[PDB]
Amino acid sequence: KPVEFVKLGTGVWMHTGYKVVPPWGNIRTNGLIIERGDYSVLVDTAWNDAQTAEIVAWAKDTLQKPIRASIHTHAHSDKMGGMDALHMLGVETFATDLTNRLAIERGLMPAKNVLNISEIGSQIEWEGLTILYPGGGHSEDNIVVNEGVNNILFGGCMIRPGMTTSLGNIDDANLGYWSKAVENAANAFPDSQIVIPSHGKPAGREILKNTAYITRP
Numbered sequence: 001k002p003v004e005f006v007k008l009g010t011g012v013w014m015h016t017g018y019k020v021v022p023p024w025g026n027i028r029t030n031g032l033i034i035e036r037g038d039y040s041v042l043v044d045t046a047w048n049d050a051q052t053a054e055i056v057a058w059a060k061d062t063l064q065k066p067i068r069a070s071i072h073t074h075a076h077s078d079k080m081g082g083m084d085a086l087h088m089l090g091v092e093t094f095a096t097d098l099t100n101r102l103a104i105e106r107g108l109m110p111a112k113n114v115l116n117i118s119e120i121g122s123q124i125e126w127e128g129l130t131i132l133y134p135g136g137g138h139s140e141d142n143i144v145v146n147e148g149v150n151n152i153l154f155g156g157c158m159i160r161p162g163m164t165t166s167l168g169n170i171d172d173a174n175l176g177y178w179s180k181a182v183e184n185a186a187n188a189f190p191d192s193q194i195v196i197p198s199h200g201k202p203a204g205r206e207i208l209k210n211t212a213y214i215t216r217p
């Protein structure tokens with residue numbers, strides 16, 4: 001049951017934690033730890049505050065590059081629940097202005113720092129990562145995160161795992177646009193051959209294509 005860590009490329013680690021949700025049971029969630037010299041930054045938390053604390057302790061004690069900032073990819077409880085816990089551990093949290101506003105509407109805490117990328121297709125660089133807003137998909141505010149040195153694209157919940165045809169949690173999905181959002185991300189990062197969904201194994205670009213097909217009306 002401890003959070004698991006694996007190295008995906010130079011300066012890039014993946015964390016993976018599990019939670020049990022009836023009826024189907026165990027489900028994984030993935031995030032990234034990105035080395036930034038003397039410190040590291042976090043791309044999405046684990047399921048809960050205890051697992052997120054494990055990630056912070058691992059960066060401090062095993063990597064010996066403490067996590068000092070983090071980015072959060074949309075306004076859902078498993079992504080935004082840890083804003084205060086990260087704050088209490090001295091991590092500067094980041095999210096888009098839209099994610100913060102939706103977080104507050106949905107009864108969640110916003111990130112402490114805001115990134116402005118409101119137009120579909122707009123990008124910003126943050127801690128050496130490219131942050132793209134590709135339009136609504138899984139959630140209206142979902143962003144993706146591309147690491148250009150290793151060409152690793154983190155898709156979060158917006159990318160479905162494997163060859164599934166299931167859609168995951170679509171309570172807040174933009175079913176009109178989600179397929180186009182996936183194509184926007186694929187076109188924005190053509191060199192990224194490693195794609196990380198929130199809930200499955202790391203894979204190639206075939207999961208961008210599969211997601212786009214299965215979420216299209």
Ligand SMILES: [Cl-]
Pocket residue numbers: none
């Ligand atoms: Cl406080």
Ligand SMILES: [Cl-]
Pocket residue numbers: 096097098099115116117118
């Ligand atoms: Cl925004």
Ligand SMILES: [Cl-]
Pocket residue numbers: 157167168169199
């Ligand atoms: Cl999902």
Ligand SMILES: [Cl-]
Pocket residue numbers: 076157169
């Ligand atoms: Cl979800």
